[PDB]
């Protein structure tokens, strides 16, 4: 499919205070890669992420139409915005496409920039908003990431345990697929701090 | 907590509607750290309260003015401004119903040193018309004019005069 | 005067501006007076004619205005702006029974009038209708209605109307009237309707001068009384 | 006219601190102070 | 000869004829606003010309999201555009952010709407201020604006007949901090001020926010609050 | 006369419109910016400080516009607004194409071609609106401009537009630095320009404001700093005048 | 510059020459003691010099009716935001249209 035409993987997790969002690394056309380092997460403001997986020319158009909005936004008012806005902003950009539709379905994860709350939610490929408690996940390998996250998500987790669920769960599913992997990148954000790890993966 | 603070104040209004001053005198005594429990601008009222159901029960004078000093001097002790102030205000009021002749406007000079000095405004219009009728208590027509003069330019500027309109009126 | 000459619709240093105020007075042109009146389950409109001509015809002078069949209306002003502003009216009231799917407010459609006379005086190059008109109708849960709308796009809802030439006088008349306990069955709203105007302006009328439109609720049709019953009313407030 | 000023105000100047031959700066100050009462109005920035 | 466009100017100063449309915003009822420690109250001045006139008809107090009301002292007719105008425009941001649009950003788009009757140059200014409440994340607003397309945030302020007597009684009556109680005693006794008649609880109609939403008082509300008032 | 339109032109020859409108900036607010190394700043004067207002915003004068740089404002209020949304909506447009930041020059001549555009065209009112700039960029660091209503603007390295602002640029020439220009210095520059052109006496720092831009780690900080810290730099000029007269 | 040569101008006057203005109308006035008159030219932010006698005038008129000769610093304080008069700008409407 158009989805199937260059891969990827995009993963978000919710902790205890805490919150991880995951993706690989593998850009390439359809069984010939390009190269390994292809970003598909992108910051808005801090404590506050997004991803996106699909179609690689609307994942590059997107992430700049969507930060277009975002910084009209916060000059029009003083504050930076909370995570249930940019979810409505996000779906109401994909659905201005509703029959010339982006081939793109995001991610996004964030706390809340008051509290401490953290949030993940995710979308469909012309906004179809859906939130979730445990983890949300796209890409071309969905079912593999699905399988590994009913069996290793637990409800109450420190960031250290936090960062080995999602780490075993993208190494064991990406190896699975055929078009994604060539590395995977992870942030784990918290109130304190950003922490941004590489993991050594298969190069195969 | 409130049950034994509203005891004392049962107690307190029984002192004061029946008619006996000695054991509501030690009353105002036993007052003094029960101050210390509640909002600082807002405990001044209630040593308001005490002390004019204190006076108006009847004319002894020999506890009166006596305590109301007490009381200025444990204000130089703790150093609360609006406290003593309404302790002063009420003082020289006392001084004009036996109309003393030189420490009534003696206090009157001394507080109004700091008050036009200070902050405050809606004191200072009663203090002002206090003098105006000292003043004509010792028979100077020109200076309770010109004392009455400088309260109505500042009686002006207050929210409400609500009661004081007709006493300046 | 500071002196404008008030040519187009712009302001005065005074605060007030003078084309629309110079269309209150436009009304007067056409020589006619207007009453409606409010007091019970009941609202009544009456309306003198004015047949100058034998020629002339009968049936095609009337100025009561059948809007929907639960909501008429009467005109004053100039003619020819008057009919104008019952097609708007007609026109607006099918389009909220199409979008909305049910009967249009007697209150709501004044709302719409106004408006289109708002734009007017907002937005110059066009003439403002020097015409007013006054509507009544039965709504549920609210009793009968009379609302009057200005040429400024000002309205209001109110018990005694008057409109014409005579407001004055004949407002003057019914504060006197309706300042007093009355239950205004029926026989009593049609009597003073008449002798509210029977105050004014000295006439003398065998029954065939006037319009009386009516709406009730018992039948919240509206209807135009015919020239028999309005000379039954003629003699039954009149002994 | 207006050099006839100037020539009798720098001669002025030269005066006021005492001189007989007068220099570049009486001519400065006598045009400073001679002028500036009429010239008002001008498009500065406008133009180039 | 510069009184009577608007696409030009004066040789010294400004604008004429916006000059001249605040002119018609004096002429008009009088209306007090005060914004509380918790809450903002609005009064106005509802007089009819005649005893016929229903007063249950037309409303000044007026809503437009549930926590945010707005009134006015200028020309009624024209109000009532940019309420409706100002009812659709705050709907739009709900339907792209799903969220209540705060305060401040209302006065920034109802302003430049305002805005654009003040251009070329057939059209009239409008006739009409307004005063705008709500209660949006704890701390209430209240602000004001004009004909010409400004904004402010008042602490209390008062428009109309005779606001000048207003002013310079709020600005002896106001402080940091009173309930939302005591801001409508002295909300009524301000408009008490310049008054003609007997004040029911038909002249005057008041709406409040709390930070429980916006609402209007019912004539029963503002008759008790009228009853034994100072 | 020639009081019509900004079309047309005088005989002899020139635009009165434009002139009325540009003579009409003296009658606003004050602004200024200064020379700095390592830094630019900007200075305004609060009117209208009535005590029945409540500075919701606590920024009037001052719109930070892209993210490394802001801009006062000196004219009418309906006018001002519309150019600011008009000139944040200007970067972010640069931005989206070419994924970089607006160099500070050719978004100053993007607005000035807006603003220009109302002298030619009827009937238009031309803007009454001077304005100033601030900004660091990657081709010359920090840098100043001056917006005018003919569409005119220049590069300056201190300047100063508004009421009384023709006697404080004599001021500004008498107190030139060159190489020496530290923000300390430069700050304890602008707190005196202020003082000679506000008659109000002893410089209330809710009658001022005071905006940075510094330059740290890559991030170019814009500090719009409160009233707790405009105290010490007021009666720090306090400090100087008193001691300044022992010589005499 | 033919016929008119020099042209002088007539600024009003500064805080020093405002406080010696002051000291040449209040020579034959009657001062108490204790009396500041800089703080009073430091009150007058442009004056004219034609109202610093208005000034004298009004602080002798004030002892006047108390038929007195005396004066305090406070009488000027007084004085001062007498002649001082403003117009008051209402409704900030003109004056916020026009930041």
Same mark, same amino acid.
């Given at each position: 499919?158009?989805?199937?035409?260059?891969?990827?993987?995009?993963?978000?997790?919710?902790?205890?205070?805490?919150?991880?969002?995951?993706?690989?690394?593998?850009?390439?056309?359809?069984?010939?890669?390009?190269?390994?380092?292809?970003?598909?997460?992108?910051?808005?403001?801090?404590?506050?992420?997004?991803?996106?997986?699909?179609?690689?020319?609307?994942?590059?158009?997107?992430?700049?139409?969507?930060?277009?909005?975002?910084?009209?936004?916060?000059?029009?008012?003083?504050?930076?915005?909370?995570?249930?806005?940019?979810?409505?902003?996000?779906?109401?950009?994909?659905?201005?496409?509703?029959?010339?539709?982006?081939?793109?379905?995001?991610?996004?994860?964030?706390?809340?920039?008051?509290?401490?709350?953290?949030?993940?939610?995710?979308?469909?490929?012309?906004?179809?908003?859906?939130?979730?408690?445990?983890?949300?996940?796209?890409?071309?390998?969905?079912?593999?990431?699905?399988?590994?996250?009913?069996?290793?998500?637990?409800?109450?987790?420190?960031?250290?345990?936090?960062?080995?669920?999602?780490?075993?769960?993208?190494?064991?599913?990406?190896?699975?697929?055929?078009?994604?992997?060539?590395?995977?990148?992870?942030?784990?954000?918290?109130?304190?701090? +950003?922490?941004?790890?590489?993991?050594?993966?298969?190069?195969? | 907590?409130?049950?034994?603070?509203?005891?004392?104040?049962?107690?307190?209004?029984?002192?004061?509607?029946?008619?006996?001053?000695?054991?509501?005198?030690?009353?105002?005594?036993?007052?003094?750290?029960?101050?210390?429990?509640?909002?600082?601008?807002?405990?001044?009222?209630?040593?308001?309260?005490?002390?004019?159901?204190?006076?108006?029960?009847?004319?002894?004078?020999?506890?009166?003015?006596?305590?109301?000093?007490?009381?200025?001097?444990?204000?130089?002790?703790?150093?609360?401004?609006?406290?003593?102030?309404?302790?002063?205000?009420?003082?020289?009021?006392?001084?004009?119903?036996?109309?003393? @002749?030189?420490?009534?406007?003696?206090?009157?000079?001394?507080?109004?040193?700091?008050?036009?000095?200070?902050?405050?405004?809606?004191?200072?219009?009663?203090?002002?018309?206090?003098?105006?009728?000292?003043?004509?208590?010792?028979?100077?027509?020109?200076?309770?004019?010109?004392?009455?003069?400088?309260?109505?330019?500042?009686?002006?500027?207050?929210?409400?005069?609500?009661?004081?309109?007709?006493?300046?009126? | 005067?500071?002196?404008?000459?008030?040519?187009?619709?712009?302001?005065?240093?005074?605060?007030?501006?003078?084309?629309?105020?110079?269309?209150?007075?436009?009304?007067?042109?056409?020589?006619?007076?207007?009453?409606?009146?409010?007091?019970?389950?009941? /609202?009544?409109?009456?309306?003198?004619?004015?047949?100058?001509?034998?020629?002339?015809?009968?049936?095609?002078?009337?100025?009561?205005?059948?809007?929907?069949?639960?909501?008429?209306?009467?005109?004053?002003?100039?003619?020819?702006?008057?009919?104008?502003?019952?097609?708007?009216?007609?026109?607006?009231?099918?389009?909220?029974?199409?979008?909305?799917? @049910?009967?249009?407010?007697?209150?709501?459609?004044?709302?719409?009038?106004?408006?289109?006379?708002?734009?007017?005086?907002?937005?110059?190059?066009?003439?403002?209708?020097?015409?007013?008109?006054?509507?009544?109708?039965?709504?549920?849960?609210?009793?009968?209605?009379?609302?009057?709308?200005?040429?400024?796009?000002?309205?209001?809802?109110?018990?005694?109307?008057?409109?014409?030439?005579?407001?004055?006088?004949?407002?003057?008349?019914?504060?006197?009237?309706?300042?007093?306990?009355?239950?205004?069955?029926?026989?009593?709203?049609?009597?003073?309707?008449?002798?509210?105007?029977?105050?004014?302006?000295?006439?003398?009328?065998?029954?065939?001068?006037?319009?009386?439109?009516?709406?009730?609720?018992?039948?919240?049709?509206?209807?135009?009384? %015919?020239?028999?019953?309005?000379?039954?009313?003629?003699?039954?407030?009149?002994? | 006219?207006?050099?006839?000023?100037?020539?009798?105000?720098?001669?002025?100047?030269?005066?006021?601190?005492?001189?007989?031959?007068?220099?570049?700066?009486?001519?400065?100050?006598?045009?400073?102070?001679?002028?500036?009462?009429?010239?008002?109005?001008?498009?500065?920035?406008?133009?180039? | 000869? @510069?009184?009577?466009?608007?696409?030009?100017?004066?040789?010294?100063?400004?604008?004429?004829?916006?000059?001249?449309?605040?002119?018609?915003?004096?002429?008009?009822?009088?209306?007090?606003?005060?914004?509380?420690?918790?809450?903002?109250?609005?009064?106005?001045?509802?007089?009819?010309?005649?005893?016929?006139?229903?007063?249950?008809?037309?409303?000044?107090?007026?809503?437009?999201?549930?926590?945010?009301?707005?009134?006015?002292?200028?020309?009624?007719?024209?109000?009532?555009?940019?309420?409706?105008?100002?009812?659709?425009?705050?709907?739009?941001?709900?339907?792209?952010?799903?969220?209540?649009?705060?305060?401040?950003?209302?006065?920034?788009?109802? /302003?430049?709407?305002?805005?654009?009757?003040?251009?070329?140059?057939?059209?009239?200014?409008?006739?009409?201020?307004?005063?705008?409440?709500?209660?949006?994340?704890?701390?209430?607003?209240?602000?004001?604006?004009?004909?010409?397309?400004?904004?402010?945030?008042?602490?209390?302020?008062?428009?109309?007949?005779?606001?000048?007597?207003?002013?310079?009684?709020?600005?002896?009556?106001?402080?940091?901090?009173?309930?939302?109680?005591?801001?409508?005693?002295?909300? +009524?006794?301000?408009?008490?001020?310049?008054?003609?008649?007997?004040?029911?609880?038909?002249?005057?109609?008041?709406?409040?926010?709390?930070?429980?939403?916006?609402?209007?008082?019912?004539?029963?509300?503002?008759?008790?609050?009228?009853?034994?008032?100072? | 006369?020639?009081?019509?339109?900004?079309?047309?032109?005088?005989?002899?020859?020139?635009?009165?419109?434009?002139?009325?409108?540009?003579?009409?900036?003296?009658?606003?607010?004050?602004?200024?910016?200064?020379?700095?190394?390592?830094?630019?700043?900007?200075?305004?004067?609060?009117?209208?400080?009535?005590?029945?207002?409540?500075?919701?915003?606590?920024?009037?004068?001052?719109?930070?516009?892209?993210?490394?740089?802001?801009?006062?404002?000196?004219?009418?209020?309906?006018?001002?607004?519309?150019?600011?949304?008009?000139?944040?909506?200007?970067?972010?447009?640069?931005?989206?194409?070419?994924?970089?930041?607006?160099?500070?020059?050719?978004?100053?001549?993007?607005?000035?071609?807006?603003?220009?555009?109302?002298?030619?065209?009827?009937?238009?009112?031309?803007?009454?609106?001077?304005?100033?700039?601030?900004?660091?960029?990657?081709?010359?660091?920090?840098?100043?401009?001056?917006?005018?209503?003919?569409?005119?603007?220049?590069?300056?390295?201190?300047?100063?537009?508004?009421?009384?602002?023709?006697?404080?640029?004599?001021?500004?020439?008498?107190?030139?630095?060159?190489?020496?220009?530290?923000?300390?210095?430069?700050?304890?520059?602008?707190?005196?320009?202020?003082?000679?052109?506000?008659?109000?006496?002893?410089?209330?720092?809710?009658?001022?404001?005071?905006? %940075?831009?510094?330059?740290?780690?890559?991030?170019?900080?814009?500090?719009?700093?409160?009233?707790?810290?405009?105290?010490?730099?007021?009666?720090?000029?306090?400090?100087?005048?008193?001691?300044?007269?022992?010589?005499? | 510059?033919?016929?008119?040569?020099?042209?002088?101008?007539?600024?009003?006057?500064?805080?020093?020459?405002?406080?010696?203005?002051?000291?040449?109308?209040?020579?034959?006035?009657?001062?108490?003691?204790?009396?500041?008159?800089?703080?009073?030219?430091?009150?007058?932010?442009?004056?004219?010099?034609?109202?610093?006698?208005?000034?004298? %005038?009004?602080?002798?008129?004030?002892?006047?009716?108390?038929?007195?000769?005396?004066?305090?610093?406070?009488?000027?304080?007084?004085?001062?935001?007498?002649?001082?008069?403003?117009?008051?700008?209402?409704?900030?409407?003109?004056?916020?249209?026009?930041?």
């Amino acid at each position: 499919s158009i989805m199937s035409y260059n891969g990827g993987a995009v993963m978000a997790m919710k902790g205890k205070n805490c919150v991880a969002i995951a993706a690989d690394r593998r850009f390439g056309i359809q069984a010939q890669m390009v190269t390994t380092d292809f970003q598909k997460i992108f910051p808005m403001g801090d404590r506050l992420y997004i991803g996106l997986a699909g179609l690689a020319t609307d994942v590059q158009t997107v992430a700049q139409r969507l930060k277009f909005r975002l910084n009209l936004y916060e000059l029009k008012e003083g504050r930076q915005i909370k995570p249930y806005t940019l979810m409505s902003m996000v779906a109401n950009l994909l659905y201005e496409k509703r029959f010339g539709p982006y081939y793109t379905e995001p991610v996004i994860a964030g706390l809340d920039p008051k509290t401490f709350k953290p949030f993940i939610c995710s979308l469909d490929l012309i906004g179809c908003p859906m939130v979730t408690d445990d983890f949300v996940v796209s890409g071309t390998c969905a079912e593999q990431m699905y399988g590994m996250c009913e069996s290793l998500w637990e409800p109450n987790m420190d960031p250290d345990h936090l960062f080995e669920t999602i780490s075993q769960a993208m190494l064991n599913a990406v190896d699975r697929d055929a078009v994604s992997g060539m590395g995977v990148i992870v942030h784990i954000i918290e109130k304190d701090k +950003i922490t941004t790890r590489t993991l050594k993966a298969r190069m195969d | 907590v409130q049950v034994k603070e509203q005891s004392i104040l049962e107690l307190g209004s029984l002192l004061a509607k029946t008619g006996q001053a000695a054991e509501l005198g030690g009353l105002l005594k036993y007052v003094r750290p029960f101050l210390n429990s509640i909002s600082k601008a807002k405990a001044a009222r209630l040593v308001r309260s005490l002390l004019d159901l204190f006076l108006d029960m009847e004319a002894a004078t020999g506890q009166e003015v006596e305590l109301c000093l007490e009381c200025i001097e444990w204000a130089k002790s703790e150093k609360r401004t609006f406290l003593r102030q309404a302790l002063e205000a009420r003082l020289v009021s006392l001084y004009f119903d036996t109309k003393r @002749y030189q420490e009534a406007l003696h206090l009157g000079s001394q507080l109004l040193r700091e008050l036009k000095k200070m902050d405050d405004k809606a004191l200072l219009v009663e203090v002002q018309l206090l003098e105006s009728k000292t003043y004509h208590a010792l028979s100077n027509l020109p200076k309770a004019r010109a004392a009455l003069t400088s309260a109505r330019t500042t009686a002006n500027a207050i929210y409400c005069p609500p009661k004081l309109q007709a006493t300046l009126d | 005067s500071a002196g404008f000459d008030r040519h187009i619709t712009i302001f005065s240093p005074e605060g007030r501006l003078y084309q629309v105020e110079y269309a209150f007075k436009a009304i007067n042109q056409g020589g006619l007076t207007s009453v409606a009146v409010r007091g019970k389950d009941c /609202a009544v409109i009456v309306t003198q004619k004015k047949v100058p001509d034998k020629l002339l015809d009968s049936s095609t002078v009337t100025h009561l205005f059948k809007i929907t069949e639960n909501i008429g209306c009467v005109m004053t002003g100039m003619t020819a702006d008057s009919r104008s502003q019952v097609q708007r009216a007609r026109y607006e009231a099918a389009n909220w029974k199409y979008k909305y799917g @049910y009967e249009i407010p007697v209150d709501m459609l004044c709302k719409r009038i106004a408006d289109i006379s708002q734009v007017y005086t907002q937005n110059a190059e066009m003439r403002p209708l020097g015409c007013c008109m006054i509507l009544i109708g039965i709504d549920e849960e609210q009793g009968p209605q009379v609302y009057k709308c200005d040429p400024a796009g000002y309205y209001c809802g109110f018990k005694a109307t008057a409109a014409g030439v005579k407001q004055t006088e004949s407002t003057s008349f019914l504060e006197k009237k309706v300042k007093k306990k009355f239950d205004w069955t029926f026989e009593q709203t049609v009597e003073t309707a008449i002798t509210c105007l029977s105050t004014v302006l000295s006439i003398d009328f065998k029954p065939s001068e006037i319009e009386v439109g009516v709406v009730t609720v018992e039948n919240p049709k509206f209807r135009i009384l %015919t020239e028999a019953e309005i000379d039954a009313h003629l003699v039954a407030l009149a002994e | 006219a207006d050099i006839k000023a100037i020539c009798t105000e720098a001669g002025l100047m030269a005066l006021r601190e005492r001189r007989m031959k007068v220099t570049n700066e009486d001519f400065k100050k006598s045009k400073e102070n001679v002028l500036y009462k009429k010239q008002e109005g001008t498009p500065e920035g406008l133009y180039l | 000869g @510069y009184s009577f466009s608007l696409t030009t100017f004066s040789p010294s100063g400004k604008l004429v004829q916006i000059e001249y449309a605040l002119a018609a915003v004096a002429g008009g009822a009088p209306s007090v606003g005060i914004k509380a420690a918790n809450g903002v109250v609005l009064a106005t001045e509802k007089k009819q010309k005649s005893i016929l006139y229903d007063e249950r008809s037309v409303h000044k107090v007026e809503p437009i999201t549930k926590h945010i009301g707005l009134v006015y002292s200028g020309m009624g007719p024209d109000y009532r555009v940019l309420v409706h105008r100002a009812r659709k425009l705050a709907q739009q941001y709900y339907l792209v952010y799903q969220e209540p649009i705060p305060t401040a950003q209302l006065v920034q788009r109802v /302003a430049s709407v305002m805005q654009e009757y003040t251009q070329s140059g057939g059209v009239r200014p409008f006739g009409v201020s307004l005063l705008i409440c709500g209660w949006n994340e704890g701390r209430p607003y209240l602000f004001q604006s004009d004909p010409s397309g400004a904004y402010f945030a008042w602490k209390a302020t008062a428009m109309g007949k005779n606001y000048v007597n207003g002013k310079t009684f709020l600005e002896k009556r106001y402080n940091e901090d009173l309930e939302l109680e005591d801001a409508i005693h002295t909300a +009524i006794l301000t408009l008490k001020e310049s008054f003609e008649g007997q004040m029911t609880e038909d002249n005057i109609e008041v709406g409040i926010c709390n930070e429980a939403g916006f609402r209007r008082l019912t004539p029963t509300e503002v008759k008790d609050y009228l009853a034994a008032i100072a | 006369r020639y009081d019509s339109r900004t079309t047309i032109f005088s005989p002899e020859g020139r635009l009165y419109q434009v002139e009325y409108a540009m003579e009409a900036i003296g009658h606003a607010g004050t602004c200024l910016g200064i020379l700095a190394n390592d830094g630019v700043l900007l200075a305004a004067e609060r009117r209208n400080i009535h005590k029945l207002l409540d500075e919701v915003f606590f920024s009037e004068k001052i719109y930070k516009l892209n993210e490394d740089m802001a801009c006062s404002v000196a004219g009418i209020t309906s006018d001002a607004n519309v150019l600011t949304n008009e000139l944040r909506l200007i970067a972010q447009r640069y931005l989206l194409q070419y994924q970089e930041p607006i160099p500070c020059e050719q978004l100053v001549t993007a607005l000035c071609d807006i603003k220009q555009a109302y002298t030619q065209f009827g009937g238009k009112r031309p803007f009454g609106v001077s304005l100033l700039y601030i900004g660091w960029d990657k081709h010359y660091g920090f840098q100043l401009y001056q917006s005018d209503p003919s569409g005119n603007y220049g590069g300056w390295k201190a300047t100063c537009i508004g009421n009384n602002s023709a006697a404080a640029v004599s001021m500004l020439k008498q107190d030139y630095k060159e190489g020496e220009m530290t923000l300390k210095s430069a700050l304890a520059l602008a707190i005196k320009v202020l003082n000679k052109t506000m008659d109000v006496s002893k410089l209330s720092a809710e009658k001022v404001e005071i905006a %940075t831009l510094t330059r740290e780690n890559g991030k170019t900080v814009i500090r719009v700093l409160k009233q707790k810290e405009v105290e010490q730099l007021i009666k720090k000029h306090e400090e100087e005048e008193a001691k300044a007269e022992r010589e005499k | 510059p033919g016929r008119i040569d020099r042209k002088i101008e007539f600024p009003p006057p500064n805080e020093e020459a405002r406080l010696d203005i002051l000291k040449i109308h209040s020579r034959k006035m009657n001062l108490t003691r204790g009396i500041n008159l800089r703080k009073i030219a430091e009150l007058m932010p442009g004056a004219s010099g034609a109202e610093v006698k208005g000034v004298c %005038t009004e602080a002798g008129m004030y002892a006047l009716r108390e038929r007195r000769v005396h004066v305090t610093q406070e009488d000027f304080e007084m004085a001062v935001a007498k002649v001082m008069q403003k117009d008051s700008e209402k409704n900030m409407s003109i004056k916020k249209l026009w930041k």
